[PDB]
Design a protein around this motif. Structure first.
Motif, PDB file in Angstrom:
ATOM      1  N   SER A  62       0.904  -1.239   0.051  1.00 42.70           N
ATOM      2  CA  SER A  62       0.072   0.059   0.347  1.00 42.70           C
ATOM      3  C   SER A  62       1.236   1.169   0.169  1.00 42.70           C
ATOM      4  O   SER A  62       1.598   1.280   0.274  1.00 42.70           O
ATOM      5  N   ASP A  63       0.399   2.350  -0.465  1.00 40.52           N
ATOM      6  CA  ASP A  63       1.352   3.378  -0.562  1.00 40.52           C
ATOM      7  C   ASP A  63       0.403   4.003   0.908  1.00 40.52           C
ATOM      8  O   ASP A  63      -0.356   4.491   0.945  1.00 40.52           O
ATOM      9  N   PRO A  64       1.717   4.224   1.889  1.00 38.21           N
ATOM     10  CA  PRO A  64       1.692   4.203   3.394  1.00 38.21           C
ATOM     11  C   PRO A  64       0.639   6.186   4.018  1.00 38.21           C
ATOM     12  O   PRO A  64       0.376   6.508   4.530  1.00 38.21           O
ATOM     13  N   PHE A  73      -2.838   4.552   2.604  1.00 41.34           N
ATOM     14  CA  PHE A  73      -2.835   3.672   3.140  1.00 41.34           C
ATOM     15  C   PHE A  73      -3.784   3.617   1.522  1.00 41.34           C
ATOM     16  O   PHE A  73      -4.312   2.249   1.865  1.00 41.34           O
ATOM     17  N   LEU A  84      -6.699   1.850   9.161  1.00 42.88           N
ATOM     18  CA  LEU A  84      -5.315   1.765   7.985  1.00 42.88           C
ATOM     19  C   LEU A  84      -4.263   1.583   9.095  1.00 42.88           C
ATOM     20  O   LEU A  84      -3.907   1.644  10.121  1.00 42.88           O
ATOM     21  N   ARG A  85      -3.784   0.583   7.887  1.00 45.01           N
ATOM     22  CA  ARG A  85      -1.755   0.719   8.404  1.00 45.01           C
ATOM     23  C   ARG A  85      -0.903   0.775   7.852  1.00 45.01           C
ATOM     24  O   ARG A  85      -0.907   0.397   6.046  1.00 45.01           O
ATOM     25  N   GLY A  86       0.090   0.995   7.901  1.00 43.08           N
ATOM     26  CA  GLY A  86       1.489   0.552   7.619  1.00 43.08           C
ATOM     27  C   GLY A  86       2.834   1.232   7.366  1.00 43.08           C
ATOM     28  O   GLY A  86       2.865   1.600   9.311  1.00 43.08           O
ATOM     29  N   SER A  87       4.043   1.628   6.834  1.00 43.03           N
ATOM     30  CA  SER A  87       4.453   2.272   7.417  1.00 43.03           C
ATOM     31  C   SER A  87       5.712   2.529   5.949  1.00 43.03           C
ATOM     32  O   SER A  87       5.600   2.062   4.765  1.00 43.03           O
TER      33      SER A  87
END
Lengths: 52, 52
Positions: free
Chosen positions: A45-47, A50, B42-45
């Protein structure tokens, strides 16, 4: 005639036929297609936003 | 009086009250709150510094 496997090339551009040989082996095939990696999914995903 | 449901506007700007009507049938609303999506996480880094 019970002898040649006939296939239709649905995207032929003009009008032709190709006669070819394929043996019981894979080595005896004329042309080879040898997949090593196939349809490996990649995900993230593009953080920043998201969106997957 | 057993008749009006009283609520406190904990963030009231001055000093007032609003009397309103709400029927047993939600169509008799005046105003409708109609949720569609409830708090999707939503989650990410960010891979440049890996911070979440």
């Amino acid at each position: 005639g019970g002898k040649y496997r006939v296939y239709i090339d649905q995207y032929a551009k003009q009008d032709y036929f190709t006669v070819g040989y394929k043996g019981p082996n894979e080595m005896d095939a004329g042309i080879y297609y040898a997949p090593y990696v196939a349809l490996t999914p990649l995900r993230g995903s593009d953080p920043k936003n998201f969106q997957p």
